[PDB]
Structures are given as structure tokens and as C-alpha cells.
Design a protein around this ligand. Structure first.
Ligand SMILES: O=C(O)[C@H]1O[C@@H](O[C@H]2[C@H](O)[C@H](O)[C@H](O[C@H]3[C@H](O)[C@H](O)[C@H](O)O[C@@H]3C(=O)O)O[C@@H]2C(=O)O)[C@@H](O)[C@@H](O)[C@@H]1O
Ligand SMILES: O=C(O)C1=C[C@H](O)[C@H](O)[C@H](O[C@H]2[C@H](O)[C@H](O)[C@H](O[C@H]3[C@H](O)[C@H](O)[C@H](O)O[C@@H]3C(=O)O)O[C@@H]2C(=O)O)O1
Length: 226
């Protein structure tokens, strides 16, 4: 009894350009499955036309992974001259108790390193400054450097919010409701890597492994320009 996001034509293109992973990195629905009405408790269309992702457990996910319409996985030069842009309208609800961080958008390399995570966090301390209930950008300092550079982007609101990630020429920028919140951060540490976008709910370090993280997307798309 779940309505498929594919029933809304605003999602047809991105679903044609995606596959769905759940609850780990195994694909449960390819683009053709998604376009043919795939729906489940963890991925469905709400009555007010949000594509909602929901998942419980440590490091579990319900996430779309960027694909080419050809069925090739997206694997663009992370630092190349072609601009790659992801845009999304996202409504982050109040997370259930025990949910401490939920990653909603990523630039991920073609191995095991997230270039960029945009995530909601219950708390974060960045150079002696503690912020509570915010949206955060985390950019890994390298494949061999586990550390990352973190930047508060927005105070969490339940309101629908426009996010835009623009990646071009060794730099990455993020806008939130049209306002630049991260201005050409350097990602040259991923020279020689290939990259792709992801969107959904990725549940990081919950304290209640039973609680559900939940994220709603009113619009979502990813493109390139040559
Ligand atoms: O505030 C810090 O910078 C904090 O980060 C700690 O390492 C983090 C790292 O910053 C980053 O958040 C990373 O993110 C993970 C993510 O949680 C998830 O597991 C994903 O699958 O992979 C991401 C990744 O590998 O980058 O998680 C690290 C973590 O240990 O939680 C430390 O550097 C810490 O000293 C520092 O205060
Ligand atoms: O998503 C993360 O932020 C996360 C960070 C960890 O440090 C790892 O990097 C981990 O990366 C995932 C990654 O996000 C993809 O889900 C990936 O999926 C691939 C798998 O190999 C699948 O089995 C499939 O065959 O192709 C997928 C693809 O590349 O699109 O798996 C890794 C991972 O779990 O190591 O998560």
C-alpha cells in the first residue's frame, strides 16, 4: 500500500538516471524497476508528493545513486572541466529520538571515499564552536586522510529547502535557498578520481538502532554541462 514516486513526472528523469540502494550498498531497484512503479516502506511517494526515504540502523541507507541513461554508472572526473550539478528541494522532518546524523546528499568517489556529504546533525563542534540542529557540509581531506573539513550550512527547519551542489574544475560550491554557503571549496585531493552524486537518507551513528531516519524530497535532479 505505497504509492510509487514514478507516478510523478517531476521524478521521471532522475529515476531514469538512478538506481536505488537499500539497506546497504546492494541495489534493490534499477532505473527500469524504479520507472515501473517501485515502492516500499523505505521509498515511496507521500500524499503531498514528496519522495520519502526512511531507514533504521547504524550506517544503513535508502539512497539513489546517480546513473547514466545508458545504464552505465556515473563516473565523471571529480575535478574535470565539465560542471556537474545536483539540485534538490528537501524537507528534513524532526528526526526520531536516537537519530543523530542523516546524510541527505553526497558526491562520492568510485571507490570508498565520500568527497562531500551534506547531512543533518544533532550536534557538531567545529574548532571549539558547538552547533545544535543544523545542516552540515563535510569534505574529506583525502582518500588516505580520514579527517574532513566541516562547514555549517543552515539551521535545521522543517520547511522545504533548495540545495544545489556545483562541482567544476577542482572546486565545489553549495547554495542553500539560493544563498552560497560554501564558496568553491577545494577538492583537488580527488584529482584522478571519478565521482557521482547520491541522494536520500544515510543514517550515521544512531544511538537507537531501531529508530527511523526519514527525509523527504519534493524535487531532485542531476545534470552535466559540456
Ligand atoms: O569533527 C570532526 O571532523 C571529527 O570527524 C571524525 O572523523 C569523521 C569524519 O570527519 C567524517 O565525518 C566521517 O564521515 C564518515 C561517515 O560518518 C560515514 O561513516 C561514511 O560512511 O564515511 C564517512 C567518511 O569516512 O568520511 O566519519 C568520521 C568519524 O570517525 O565519525 C574524526 O576526525 C574526529 O577526530 C573529528 O573530531
Ligand atoms: O555512502 C557513504 O558515504 C559511505 C562511506 C563509506 O566510507 C564508504 O565509502 C561507503 O561507500 C559506499 C558507496 O556510497 C556506494 O553505496 C557503494 O555502492 C557500490 C557497491 O560496490 C555495490 O555493491 C554496487 O555493485 O555498485 C555500487 C556503486 O558504486 O554504485 O558501496 C560503498 C561501500 O559500501 O563501500 O559508504
Amino acid at each position: 500500500f505505497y504509492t510509487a514516486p514514478s507516478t510523478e513526472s517531476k521524478f521521471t528523469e532522475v529515476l531514469s538516471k538512478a538506481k536505488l540502494q537499500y539497506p546497504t550498498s546492494t541495489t534493490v531497484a534499477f532505473a527500469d524497476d524504479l520507472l515501473d512503479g517501485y515502492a516500499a516502506s523505505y521509498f515511496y511517494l507521500t500524499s503531498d508528493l514528496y519522495m520519502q526515504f526512511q531507514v533504521a540502523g547504524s550506517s544503513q541507507r535508502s539512497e539513489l545513486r546517480e546513473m547514466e541513461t545508458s545504464g552505465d554508472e556515473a563516473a565523471w572526473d571529480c575535478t574535470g572541466s565539465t560542471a556537474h550539478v545536483a539540485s534538490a528541494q528537501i524537507a528534513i522532518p524532526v528526526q526520531e529520538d536516537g537519530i543523530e546524523e542523516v546524510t541527505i546528499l553526497q558526491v562520492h568517489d568510485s571507490d570508498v571515499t565520500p568527497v562531500l556529504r551534506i547531512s543533518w546533525v544533532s550536534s557538531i563542534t567545529i574548532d571549539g564552536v558547538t552547533s545544535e540542529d543544523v545542516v552540515l557540509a563535510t569534505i574529506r581531506n583525502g582518500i588516505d586522510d580520514s579527517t574532513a573539513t566541516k562547514t555549517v550550512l543552515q539551521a535545521h527547519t522543517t520547511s522545504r529547502t533548495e540545495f544545489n551542489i556545483n562541482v567544476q574544475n577542482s572546486k565545489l560550491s553549495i547554495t542553500v535557498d539560493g544563498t552560497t554557503e560554501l564558496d568553491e571549496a577545494d577538492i583537488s585531493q580527488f584529482d584522478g578520481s571519478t565521482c557521482y552524486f547520491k541522494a536520500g537518507a544515510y543514517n550515521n551513528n544512531p544511538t537507537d538502532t531501531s529508530a527511523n531516519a526519514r527525509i523527504k524530497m519534493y524535487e531532485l535532479e542531476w545534470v552535466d554541462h559540456h
